[PDB]
Design a protein around this ligand. Structure first.
Ligand SMILES: N[C@H](CO)Cc1ccc(O)cc1
Length: 673
C-alpha cells in the first residue's frame, strides 16, 4: 500500500491539533521527499504515557507519510530549566533510558535520528551561538518574555535569565533545518517566533507548525499531567496494579467531548466536562491505525462510536474504565517485559532508580562558584561606537597608566566586544560593521598612546578559544540571577533581549580572564557592576576619568579619535570664542593641553603682540579677557597642537585603516536613511 498525495497529507495532518499553514504542509508533501519533522525534550525523569506512547504513535505517522524524524535530545535545555537538581552529568543517562523505552514501545526507528544538544552545539559553536544572539538582537524583550509557557513557567517578573532558553529553542529550528515543527501545543509561542524571524532574516520558506494535542490529566482539576501528582497520568513504569488504581479513580464525566478553542499561549485549560478517560481512548488507542475498543462482546470501530455508547449509557463507566485498563496494560507490558529481561536495559532503569534516591525540594539545585586570581588583573571594554570621542579615549588611557603604577606587577586587558555588541544591537547591528568599527577605533587609541603592556583581545578569540567552558559559565551565571535584576543595570529597561545576553557575556569574560578589577567608561554605564555583584563584591570597580574636552558649541562639534586633516581644521573654526572672554570651550581645551604638556606656547610675531608661553591656568584666563590674547592667536596655536599630536593616528586613516574606513562611512550612510 503505497499512499497517494491525498492519503499522506491526511495522515500527516492527522498528527496535529492545529497545523499552521495546511497549504504549506501540502506543498511539502507534493514536492519534498525527506521532510524533516523535529521535536525535542528535556530528559526530566520518569516517562509519562503521553510522551512514551502517544508520541510514538505520532512519530510513526510522520515516518509513514514519508518524513524523517529528528529528535533534539535537549540536555542543556533541561539544565537551564532546573529539571533534575541541576545535575547534568548523567541526565544523559536518563536520555539514554527514554530512547530505550521508545524502542520497546514501538517507535519505528528506520527514519528517526537522535541528536544531543550538547554534542551538536559545542561542535558548531560559532554557527549556533551567533544566531542565538541574532534572534535576541532583532526582538523586543517583551516578545521573548512572552515565550515563558514552553518551559512550564509564568511570565510573572519571576523568570531567571531564562529568556535565553527560548532564543536557543528558536535557533534549534534553523540549526537542524526543520521543515515541520512537530512539538506539543505548549511550544506554540517559540515556533511562532521562528516564523516571525523568517521574515526578518529574509528566508522565504517558514517552518510548518504541526502542534500535537496535550493529554488531559486523570483528575477533575488538571488539564495536563503535573509532576507533584503521580496519579495525574499513567507512567511507563507503572505496574498493572498501578495502572488499575490510577484509572479506576480517574475523573470521567458523561459528556460528549468536543475540541477546545485554540489558546494563544497553547497551554491547556481544564473544563469540568473534560473527560480524560475518553481523551486517553482517543489518543492512546484509536489514534493507532488498526486499533479499536471492544467491550462486553461489541467492538467499537471509531472512537466516536465508543463515545456515543458511553454517553447514551450503552456502556457503563465501570466497563469503559475496565476496558482502558486492559487496553493500556497491553501497551505497557512490552516495555515492562523488556526491562525484566534485557540486563543492559534493566541496568539502565535501575540506573534511573539509583538517581531517584531521596529527591528534590530541596537537597537539589546545582550551580558553580569560581576562584580568586593569584595576582592583580584589570579588564576594560572598548566602546562599541562608530566615532569615539577624544575625551573618552584619553580618559581610558590614563586609567590604564594609573592602574599599572598602583599595581606594578599586575595586568590590564582591553576587550573588543565583537560578539556582545552585535547582540546589544549597537551601531548598524551588522557584524562586519561593528568588527570594523572596533578594529579601527582600537588601532587609533594605540596611536594616541595606549600603553603596549595592555593586552588587546577580541571576544571572538576568547570564546572560540575556549568555547564550551564559556557558554556553560554564561548558562550558570544566567541561572542564579533573575531577569528583573539584569534589567536594573540598563536603568530598569532594555531595548532588546540581546542586552540581557550582553551583560551575561561580560561577567563571563571577566571570570575567564580571571580579573580582579573591572574598568568602566561613561558609555559602559552600570553594566560592568554586574561583575562585582556576582563575585560577592570581590571584584573591585574602577571608573574612567572624563569631562576635560568639551563640546565646542557655546552654552559635529566634538573631537573624535578618527578626525583627519579637514575635520580637525574645521571643527575648531566653529568652536565658540567670544572676545575678552575668560570662560569658553577653546580655553577648556587649551588648559587641558597645557596640563598635559607642561607649558602652552602661542607663536606670534613681534609688534602684533610678540610671542608668549603660559605654564599655569590662572595666567591664561587673565590674558584671555582682561588681556592681550585674541581668539585667533589661541585657536591658531591649539589647532597646530591637536594636529601635531594626532599626526601619527591620522596617517593610518589614509593608509592602513583606509580599507575599513570605506566600510565605516558606508555604515554611517544607513543610519542617516
Ligand atoms: N522546551 C522544550 C520542551 O520543554 C524542549 C526543547 C524542544 C526543542 C528544542 O529545540 C529545544 C528544547
Amino acid at each position: 500500500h503505497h499512499m497517494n498525495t491525498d492519503e499522506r497529507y491526511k495522515l500527516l495532518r492527522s498528527v496535529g491539533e492545529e497545523c499552521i499553514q495546511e497549504s504549506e504542509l501540502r506543498n511539502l508533501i507534493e514536492k519534498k521527499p525527506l521532510i524533516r519533522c523535529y521535536d525535542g525534550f528535556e530528559p526530566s525523569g520518569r516517562m509519562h504515557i503521553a510522551q512514551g506512547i502517544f508520541k510514538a504513535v505520532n512519530v510513526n505517522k510522520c515516518t509513514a507519510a514519508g518524513c524523517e524524524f529528528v529528535f533534539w535530545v535537549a540536555d542543556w535545555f533541561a539544565l537551564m530549566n532546573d529539571k533534575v537538581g541541576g545535575e547534568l552529568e548523567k541526565i544523559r543517562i536518563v536520555g539514554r533510558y527514554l530512547i530505550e523505552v521508545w524502542k520497546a514501545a514501538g517507535m519505528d526507528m528506520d527514519k528517526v535520528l537522535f541528536l544531543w544538544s550538547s554534542e551538536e552545539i559545542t561542535s558548531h559553536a560559532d554557527t549556533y551561538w551567533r544566531m542565538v544572539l541574532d534572534i535576541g538582537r532583532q526582538n523586543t524583550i517583551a516578545r521573548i518574555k512572552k515565550c515563558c509557557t514552553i518551559m512550564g513557567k509564568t511570565e510573572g517578573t519571576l523568570t531567571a535569565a531564562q529568556v535565553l532558553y527560548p532564543l536557543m529553542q528558536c535557533c534549534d529550528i534553523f540549526f537542524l533545518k526543520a521543515d515541520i515543527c512537530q512539538l506539543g501545543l505548549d511550544q506554540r509561542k517559540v515556533n511562532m517566533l521562528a516564523r516571525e524571524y523568517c521574515d526578518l532574516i529574509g528566508r522565504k520558506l517558514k517552518p510548518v507548525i504541526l502542534s500535537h494535542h496535550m493529554l488531559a490529566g486523570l483528575k477533575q482539576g488538571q488539564a495536563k499531567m503535573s509532576k507533584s501528582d503521580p496519579d495525574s497520568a499513567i507512567f511507563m513504569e507503572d505496574t498493572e496494579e498501578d495502572v488499575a488504581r490510577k484509572i479506576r479513580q480517574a475523573y470521567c464525566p458523561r459528556v460528549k467531548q468536543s475540541a477546545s478553542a485554540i489558546t494563544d499561549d497553547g497551554a491547556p485549560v481544564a473544563t469540568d466536562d473534560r473527560n480524560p478517560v475518553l481523551d486517553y481512548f482517543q489518543c492512546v488507542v484509536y489514534a493507532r491505525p488498526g486499533a479499536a475498543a471492544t467491550i462486553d462482546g461489541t467492538t467499537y470501530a471509531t472512537y466516536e462510536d465508543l463515545e456515543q455508547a458511553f454517553v447514551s449509557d450503552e456502556v457503563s463507566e465501570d466497563a469503559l474504565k475496565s476496558c482502558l485498563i486492559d487496553e493500556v496494560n497491553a501497551l505497557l507490558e512490552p516495555v515492562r517485559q523488556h526491562f525484566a529481561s534485557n540486563e543492559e536495559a534493566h541496568e539502565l532503569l535501575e540506573a534511573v532508580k539509583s538517581y531517584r534516591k531521596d529527591g528534590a525540594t530541596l537537597p537539589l539545585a546545582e550551580t558553580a562558584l569560581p576562584a580568586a586570581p593569584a595576582k592583580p588583573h584589570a579588564c576594560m571594554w572598548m566602546p562599541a561606537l562608530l566615532k569615539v570621542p577624544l575625551d573618552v579615549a584619553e580618559g581610558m588611557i590614563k586609567v590604564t597608566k594609573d592602574f599599572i603604577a598602583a599595581h606594578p606587577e599586575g595586568t590590564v586587558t582591553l576587550v573588543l566586544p565583537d560578539w556582545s555588541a552585535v547582540a546589544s544591537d549597537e551601531i548598524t547591528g551588522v557584524e562586519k560593521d561593528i568588527s570594523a568599527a572596533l578594529q579601527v577605533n582600537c588601532a587609533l587609541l594605540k596611536a594616541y598612546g595606549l600603553p603596549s603592556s595592555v593586552k588587546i583581545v577580541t571576544e571572538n578569540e576568547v570564546i572560540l578559544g575556549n568555547c564550551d567552558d564559556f557558554w556553560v559559565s554564561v548558562i550558570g551565571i544566567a541561572r542564579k540571577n533573575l531577569l528583573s535584576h539584569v534589567e536594573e543595570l540598563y536603568g530598569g529597561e532594555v531595548r532588546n533581549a540581546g542586552q540581557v545576553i550582553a551583560a551575561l557575556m561580560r561577567v563571563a569574560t571577566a571570570l575567564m580572564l580571571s580579573v580582579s578589577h573591572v574598568i568602566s567608561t561613561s558609555l559602559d554605564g552600570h553594566i560592568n557592576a554586574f561583575a562585582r555583584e556576582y563575585t560577592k563584591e570581590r571584584i573591585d570597580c574602577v571608573q574612567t576619568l572624563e569631562g576635560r574636552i568639551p563640546a565646542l558649541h557655546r552654552p559635529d562639534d566634538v573631537l573624535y579619535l578618527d578626525d583627519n586633516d579637514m575635520d580637525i581644521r574645521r571643527k575648531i573654526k566653529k568652536a565658540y570664542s567670544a572676545p575678552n572672554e575668560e570662560a569658553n570651550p577653546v580655553i577648556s581645551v587649551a588648559q587641558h593641553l597645557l596640563a598635559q604638556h607642561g607649558a602652552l606656547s602661542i607663536e606670534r610675531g613681534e609688534a602684533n603682540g610678540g610671542n608668549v608661553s603660559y605654564n599655569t591656568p590662572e595666567a591664561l584666563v587673565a590674558d584671555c579677557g582682561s588681556g592681550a590674547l585674541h581668539p585667533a592667536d589661541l585657536k591658531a596655536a591649539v589647532l597646530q597642537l591637536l594636529l601635531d599630536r594626532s599626526a601619527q593616528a591620522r596617517a593610518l586613516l589614509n593608509g592602513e585603516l583606509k580599507k575599513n574606513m570605506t566600510v565605516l562611512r558606508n555604515a554611517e550612510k544607513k543610519m542617516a536613511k
